[PDB]
Design a binder for this molecule. Structure first.
Ligand SMILES: Cc1cc2nc3c(=O)[nH]c(=O)nc-3n(C[C@H](O)[C@H](O)[C@H](O)COP(=O)(O)OP(=O)(O)OC[C@H]3O[C@@H](n4cnc5c(N)ncnc54)[C@H](O)[C@@H]3O)c2cc1C
Ligand SMILES: Cc1cc2nc3c(=O)[nH]c(=O)nc-3n(C[C@H](O)[C@H](O)[C@H](O)COP(=O)(O)OP(=O)(O)OC[C@H]3O[C@@H](n4cnc5c(N)ncnc54)[C@H](O)[C@@H]3O)c2cc1C
Ligand SMILES: [Cl-]
Ligand SMILES: [Cl-]
Lengths: 431, 431
């Protein structure tokens, strides 16, 4: 008889996890609270390291990804560039070469769409908002209770339900701050301008490439989208106030509100905000930084993705971390499957618990480092000393650490992680 | 603008190669000359390394393997064992730990069948015997001519058609000795005995494990099969004569003809031969050792597996070498796919030949090493010195060479191979 996994959350991580597990013969169910709506129309990007992890999960995942972007005489290397956004000199500060297809970009909604088609029919169950978890003995199934009154029974439970995970609250208690994200005291304006507008304000070289503009207490990212016809703007600013608890995290705002935060910045950069639509959006940045999980797993329950370790997005790699989680969880559960197949139910459930323990041992340090790292690079992008031209040497000193932190993300040794995870699983089984 | 590959040969390698290609969105047709499966009931085993290569091609391949094969306590480890077959001492000479799941064994025909159920329908076409290949210009399609008089047109062709490959013939000329395999001047008697008979001749220990009995000019290997209820016997002997081809490479033989080759050997081994059926099989062992391929590929045509490098089976890993080929070719053609999206037909075809050119560069040394190493280790098994009580001191030193040559097979750095293949491909493309 087989092994069943209930994944709470039908986001990118939970769906990628499902693909990896089913392709190995594991019985999977994905329970998604939402009706069946895709993600936001925004773009996202994956490191070549995450794409290779996708491949190892199921090569159809990478096909889904590449059929969900656009079509790019020699081959283009991907570059991150930083520019001085506060002085009209707007000189280029720093550049990181990511190599050929160092990043591969897609539409979130289009990728999640292609992924669900890759899955066999009957994996994803929508309007299934989890509300309680009923654990029993290790040897017994776990019961998930949903808001619509239905129930489901699975051998083990993975929380892939995002920044406001319900599986997390069950683990730590609804009133513990560890069950919840908190504000990072920054929020973002987001919106589009046309390429001719972008060209007009920044010049063609800056307009056609991804560039981050540093300055004091704020920073702004822009990159072309929709085959170099549009440019996406993301403008992050500092907010000393608390975010009202049940106030939504996304909200409406005006280009004039954004322009005010940047009034002292150089002309081209203010023009870019001036070219946005009159109405734009305001995104509050919450994460798990103040109260990181003490453990990603307990018994036969495991957290993954933003549920385990949601981050502010200043590395553009938070889902990459989640894809590592999926690859690790998938390889471990596969090893449970093959190594206990002819054994009693006692051994099979012990092995699940040993696998989830191993997952926590090998993943928590890197993921929680990454959450911290994401806040740290924002602080470097927003040094007060960017304002002071006499403090330029200090301000620009930051880029070596940004380099180190990027390379630690991009050059992750996932083969060693998998090897370590298997060894810890066998050790945990008394082997 | 989708890339189509024609695979000639629906054996283990051609199908595995098709599974990896289709999972990546490449259009594949497999042309198989037979009308059903073959090698009905034969067993084979893959190294853990080869199983990891399968997983990177498509994890469903590994699931297929594991549903085509085989109580508490702990996890078994896999041992190659060698025993003195000549003298009456018959003492354990050497052993080699391959670890947990160091080999994974299955039934050939049942594995191939499971593999075919993994592919989408219509990929494999039976009763398609490649007769002739028509190459036109690099920017045109390769035309395949089948014996039933139909034709197929593909962007490129992969020869996965075995030891007597039609594609190889086309590459080197049907009159070249390079286009044909040749006799290794050894052949094998194969047959089964009952496990009860096996025990009373070798003892319980040896009967229930895989052992190779060495000696002068011959050797014998055995292992349990069909739930440890029978034992498979393969006795390899030397043949000074030529194998007058048109003489079928398989043929019937008698138990006593086998026994006559082992008359001087110790009693336990002779008892094993006597316990076989009166009628058994004779298998001539051909390979590509004498006239190894000058190249595995040319233009838009590539050889994989036995077509490229058929070996005598004294490492028991010939297919594992082929799975490496399939991994390496699959990753290259996928790199051709993404890297030439949107380019002109001319560039796409140049990319194909550049990839095949890179495949030849990275594989031909290891593959042809492994053909040599297969004959080499067989010689060490059949040293005339085994019989001489004066030269058994130097005869027993072969085992370090056995260990190194095995480890070189088992610990293949396929990730280095993949990396080197992409780099060579880019080099071949002018970047
Ligand atoms: C502006 C921004 C840009 C970003 N850009 C990148 C990038 O370029 N590259 C990158 O790698 N990462 C990026 N990230 C991070 C990335 O988006 C997240 O890491 C990723 O979306 C997390 O995926 P997830 O599946 O864990 O969580 P989610 O995407 O939040 O999915 C969680 C799912 O679980 C459902 N759910 C929630 N509660 C329940 C419940 N009780 N019951 C059932 N279902 C429930 C939810 O409805 C949701 O669908 C960015 C983040 C932001 C804010
Ligand atoms: C006794 C023995 C035991 C072995 N045990 C092992 C083991 O345990 N583990 C391991 O890794 N390796 C083992 N090997 C090696 C392994 O079997 C081979 O290397 C493997 O079969 C090669 O697979 P292939 O698909 O390339 O060739 P094949 O298995 O020979 O298949 C080639 C296919 O191409 C078809 N074909 C041929 N010509 C044409 C044509 N003109 N047109 C269309 N189709 C054509 C054939 O019908 C066939 O289906 C063993 C070999 C032998 C002889
Ligand atoms: Cl992010
Ligand atoms: Cl072999």
């Amino acid at each position: 008889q087989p092994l069943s996994v209930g994944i709470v959350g039908g986001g990118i991580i939970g769906v990628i996890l499902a693909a990896g597990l089913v392709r190995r013969g594991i019985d999977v169910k994905v329970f998604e609270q939402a009706r069946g709506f895709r993600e936001i129309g925004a773009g996202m990007a994956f490191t070549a390291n995450a794409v290779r992890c996708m491949e190892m999960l199921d090569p159809a995942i990478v096909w889904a990804l590449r059929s969900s972007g656009a079509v790019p005489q020699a081959e283009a290397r991907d570059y991150l560039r930083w520019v001085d956004g506060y002085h009209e000199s707007s000189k280029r500060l720093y550049q990181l070469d990511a190599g050929i297809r160092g990043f591969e970009a897609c539409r979130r909604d289009q990728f999640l769409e292609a992924l669900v088609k890759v899955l066999p029919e009957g994996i994803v169950e929508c309007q299934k908002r989890l509300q309680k978890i009923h654990e029993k003995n290790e040897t017994e199934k776990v019961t998930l209770e949903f808001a619509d009154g239905t129930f489901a029974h699975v051998d083990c439970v993975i929380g892939a339900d995002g920044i406001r995970s319900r599986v997390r609250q069950h683990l730590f208690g609804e009133d513990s701050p560890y069950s919840h994200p908190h504000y990072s005291h920054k929020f973002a304006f987001r919106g589009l301008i046309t390429m001719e507008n972008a060209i007009s304000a920044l010049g063609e070289d800056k307009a056609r490439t991804l560039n981050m503009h540093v300055g004091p207490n704020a920073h702004l990212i822009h990159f072309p989208v929709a085959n170099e016809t549009m440019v996406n703007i993301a403008a992050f600013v500092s907010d000393p106030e608390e975010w009202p608890d049940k106030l939504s995290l996304v909200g409406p705002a005006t280009r004039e509100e954004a322009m005010g935060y940047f009034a002292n910045w150089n002309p081209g950069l203010r023009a870019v905000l001036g070219f946005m639509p009159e109405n734009i959006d305001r995104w509050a940045m919450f994460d798990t930084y103040d109260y990181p999980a003490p453990f990603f797993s307990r018994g036969k329950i495991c957290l993954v993705g933003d549920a385990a370790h949601a981050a502010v997005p200043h590395h553009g790699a938070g889902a990459c971390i989640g894809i590592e989680d999926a690859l690790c969880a998938t390889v471990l559960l596969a090893e449970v499957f093959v190594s206990t197949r002819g054994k009693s139910s006692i051994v099979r459930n012990r092995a699940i618990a040993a696998a989830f323990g191993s997952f926590n041992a090998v993943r928590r340090v890197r993921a929680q480092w990454f959450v911290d790292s994401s806040r740290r690079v924002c602080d470097l992008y927003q040094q007060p000393e960017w304002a002071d031209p006499q403090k330029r040497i200090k301000a620009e000193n930051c880029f070596e650490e940004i380099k180190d932190r990027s390379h630690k993300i991009w050059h992750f040794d996932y083969n060693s992680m998998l090897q370590e995870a298997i060894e810890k699983y066998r050790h945990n089984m008394g082997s």
